[model samples]
Target chain A: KSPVPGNVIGKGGNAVVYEDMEDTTKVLKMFTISQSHEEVTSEVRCFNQYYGSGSAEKIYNDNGNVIGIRMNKINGESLLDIPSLPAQAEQAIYDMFDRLEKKGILFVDTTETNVLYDRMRNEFNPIDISSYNVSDISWSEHQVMQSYHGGKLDLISVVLSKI
Target chain B: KSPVPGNVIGKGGNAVVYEDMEDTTKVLKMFTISQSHEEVTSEVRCFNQYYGSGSAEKIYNDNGNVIGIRMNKINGESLLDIPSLPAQAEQAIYDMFDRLEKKGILFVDTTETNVLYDRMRNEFNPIDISSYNVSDISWSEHQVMQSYHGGKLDLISVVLSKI
Candidate 1:
């Protein structure tokens, strides 16, 4: 959610986004003005349902891939930059693992930039926690199929393997 | 061993480097050439001792980092490129820890790029393992400290605390 109102905030994988009037400043991701309402609504539904879960990430339809799913932008140096004497890096890694395990979910990518530490909140943030999952194959039969294929993290393929 | 002869291959925090001669070529590492011979010889002595003790990664020369040492090049991918999927990633991390742990020394610096994976060898290629036993801290600590300070990973720093 965004705290800004009236102003166009950002863009996303789905649409061009706008800041909302809500107090939380929830970002209002709207399909481009030229886009169909049905698609925008579906995108909204996806965010509200799959991503809206507390454990899940917050994403909403905005404009297009040129922007991407509305997200809490991550900032700062990457974890790989400081591998030795890492303070929060190990904990951050563990926390991400915990979140994924708890959610039974997978985030497609692990580029260091995807993860950030917010000193103010004393928290680790994985801003682009896509509802999508990625996997090369089901390493074990008990494990579900995952995305991580060509790189987009195809969640549908992963879920299908499990089902 | 490397596929090429007299060709410099990889690098690390260590001053000496090695080049591969053949598919089993000797490794070579060139240094600033202004440093003392005893300093250069120390690496060779350490390598020989470790090699004799069944440590596979041995320094083959007293002047490799200076004139260049020819040795086998370990083939693998930098740890940085390892897949982010938790299972493999976790296994790789532990495998490295276990291997290094066998030496029974406390190795605090485990940067992602510091480790490498060999697809053909079915073993890790820690090409730049140093004789960290000498100083109060592993010499690698200097490099790690540099990264921490430059990357702003130091939590105590106020400027870095902002993001």
Candidate 2:
């Protein structure tokens, strides 16, 4: 079997992102390393919940098993690369986070590198969002993970504030 | 009230398209002339049914009533202007139609002008999809309308054949 299917776009600790051979607007994210079933299931579930919410890339397919997922390929500069964002763009990002929070999606990884700022659309598109957590409880009741550091909201606040 | 809202993007027989003012990625399509409530309702219904199916633009808001619909602004060349399409692009268009047909959507206006060819995405996006019919009956049992001429599939066949 091929080590990495299609054209390799990016690689994460758990998965590899490749351009979809047929569609240029989409990419396939396949797991190259072993991961616990629970980890994969939770990620898929969170992705599904975030899908169509405009908070993350649109997922086209999620195999029954955790082999791979086909999702919209986000084309934009990373938030980290941008020195500062326009006022409206900043507000839009905040609004997206608020919308996702209200929908019970806690995007754990809010690093600037994980977010793409689409200049044409003037909107932020979050990628590599599999680390999200879903909960029915209010934000006050949620526990922040040690791995998540200060949590997504806090991190986003700091990142946006400095820029 | 203003005769039309925002910057006029495009004007159709039944509606006027304008920029959303707020979101550059979205456009608001509003009924300019007098239209029956049923007509507006059916159009909104069909748009909702076709949303996220990759056959039409993604609608963000329907405004409850038929005053307007906020949908993703499609940036592409009209199919009528395009001299020809690649085989894969043509196949993608047919596949989209097939998917919509399976979902029980009968797109009445199959004119080339109603479609946009997104060169970046290499996909066909049908516009002005409000004029559609939804039915549970199979294709064979459906009655063709005089306005529809030879029905969508037939019209699409001729359109694709000539190109």
Candidate 3:
């Protein structure tokens, strides 16, 4: 197991923090205060078992809630902090939107943190990706187009307009 | 603790699933696959301690790795589900977008399930509230906004426009 480091960025009621030596980029999550170790440990295992291509990872565990996992630690500024939308940033957002739309995901809520900005490149980033379940947007768009014009629209129109 | 009914909806690597007894409307999340008894119990306690909202409610314990909670079986038809959305449904979704803006919480992945709809009245209910600590929409949005509008926009304004 990697040596856990000190310094925690954030703390939830159930877990504590630590960093890894090999992967200093991410932090180790563990039980905090008087939290239940069993549940946290289970969450660790749950992540470990995840076979999805886009799931999180659990690096190590020490009993129940006392565990460590590698976090993405998105380097960009939070989406919420950027002000006065620029065309570049807007375009970045549009692409991300399109990407998810193509992937059957929905960009429902756009919280500040959800948006991350790379100062060097003057770009934005969405750090989180859990709110989406799964659905066919193309089908939804067609439905919306028909509703809009009292007639059905083609696939191209549906994709252009997400309903 | 509520009675753990005989019927099980799902039992997997993480937790056991139970159908609700009261209304038979929801799935009861009972355990975490890789978690210990103490851990799962603690997670439940913490969830109840802080987020005792209208979401799922735990009724009983199915040992340590198993818990029985009530769930409102997310019906297939969601705002994201409809091919063509109704006019009222549209406004209700807009209202939800507004609420997300005011609260500074993002669903990240927006769709109808994160939003629960009442078919008769056509209203949306916020089911999943999130911060960027969860998903990845900002990455996609940043590029789009950066190209043209100087990527300069108030956080509140951008969110406000989405609804």
Candidate 4:
């Protein structure tokens, strides 16, 4: 039997996350049948690039097609659920946004609800990171300077400052 | 200086192949600016799946984006340049088509020019393998039977018969 319906962990607009049958530490994010090939490929490409760093989860396996991906399972409370964050946690989240921006990545969805705060590890884990845009050219020093005020990641910065 | 124009080994409609500066055994297939992201991704996806098997070349590194890929440098004469093939070569070519069909991969460009005959290794290497379509469903026993007579791979079979 397939470990899907019985082991479902979360569901999103584009994919259904399920526990991996063979590996408890990994989860399979299967793109929905409705998801287009281009959409899936774009998400997989972005996930592969930024994973295993900052708040992004590491991708374990990708079939290089429309098929789902196996990634490290993130177990943490939603940042929205938490009333406050430690200084280090806040700093870590900011650092992640900064690093991604420097690399020409702009995270489109940066809401508090999209972030998970792992109490056990004292780290922030971002979810639904597929919503992103990668700049065609590497960001120049001037571009980076201009992005500090009105960039997509700045939205996260504003939210963190409030908390 | 970038190792591109000076080390170019081959060129195609979508990409230019360059010799890797650090690795003499590997070549980099860099997609041209005219190519779309979707097109490059599609080619990369198919190459990743069918490579390292049969007559296909092995992909050494892929950044999972529109950027070029590092793969094995195949030093061989084009199949069209060669007049005939040995019985073993014929069998090997047939076997590759059979295996790819079983896996639901259709190599669209199966012309003589797309294949290479390596005298040193006594093996055939298929080039420009990015032109393909992977069936969404695994081929059932009946489907495989139906495909043998009229499938894209059948073209290769027809070409092999004359030689």
Question: Highest TM-score among the candidates is held by which one?
Answer: 2
Who wins the DockQ comparison? 3
What is the C-alpha DockQ of each candidate? 0.01, 0.01, 0.04, 0.01
lDDT of 4 by residue, B36-64 (tens): 45445555555556665332232322343
Per-model TM against the reference: 0.32, 0.40, 0.37, 0.39
Give model 4's TM-score for chain A to 2 decimal places: 0.67
Cα RMSD for candidates in order: 20.7, 23.0, 15.1, 18.6
**Taking chain A of candidate 1, what TM-score results?**
0.45
Steric clash pairs (candidate 4):
none
Q: For residues B2-99, write the lDDT of model 2, one tens digit per residue.
A: 21235656544234466877778777665432334445455555665765532223232233333456677776787755777666676767765776
Chain B structural similarity as TM-score, candidate 2: 0.72
Each candidate structure's count of clashing pairs:
42, 0, 80, 0
Stretches of candidate 3 exceeding 4 Å from the true structure? A12-24, A29-56, A62-66, A101-110, A134-163, B1-44, B47-56, B59-163
Chain A superposition TM-score per model: 0.45, 0.71, 0.51, 0.67
Off by over 4 Å in 4: A1-6, A53-65, A131-162, B1-163
Docking class of 4: incorrect
Candidate 1, residues A99-137, lDDT tens digits: the string is 654665444444443445554443445534433312231
- Order of all candidates by lDDT, from best down to worst? 2, 4, 3, 1
